[PDB]
């Protein structure tokens, strides 16, 4: 449920 779309991990 964590995503990396910018070269880092974020909650989404």
């Amino acid at each position: 449920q964590l995503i990396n779309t910018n070269g880092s991990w974020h909650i989404n």
Partner: antibody
Amino acid sequence: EVQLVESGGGLVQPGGSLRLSCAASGYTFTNYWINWVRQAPGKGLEWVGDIYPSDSFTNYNQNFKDRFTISRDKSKNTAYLQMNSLRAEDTAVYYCARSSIYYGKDYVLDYWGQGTLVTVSS
Amino acid sequence: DIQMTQSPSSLSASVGDRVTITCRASESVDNYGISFMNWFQQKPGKAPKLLIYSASNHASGVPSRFSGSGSGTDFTLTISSLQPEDFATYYCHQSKEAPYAFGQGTKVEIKR
């Protein structure tokens, strides 16, 4: 099922350019980052950079910026590695590998291509 | 930049031996309770194969003998019972923040 096939390697003259391709198949292409990793003969692995196929978001290894360009063609399921003004130093095996946009089972560098040898010689 | 150093750079061990490889990151690879440190095994003439991810997780199709541990800056890969097929260069890798990186690698050789 899932496979990454590198291409566009081989011999290249110093000062020349090469366009490497990573043909991806068997999965949703926009759901996995494509990473480029190089290995000089008899040396360690080097992260070159990566591309997010949906928006073409790209991350680079500071040493590869402005000479190496990672691009994509969503329609051809191919990520590209443009390498310009090549030096003997650049002689290496270039791999591509996928890494999930979502954290999960075997998310990180799950699948690799067989690699292509790039020889920068006159 | 998060960079890592592995220890030892090389080892020779016997079939059945417990082998321990360490990886030190220059900065913590922890985020959201996950330790973004992975382990790859590279056999000669082959692309590296995912063994361990997020410090302790097991990739599918990887033998039991391989296990991983650690948090923050210090990580360990252990081959519980060295098999002759285990000859390879073993790399730690960080997936926390770009630029991603690999350790220099540890060449595991089998002592006969």
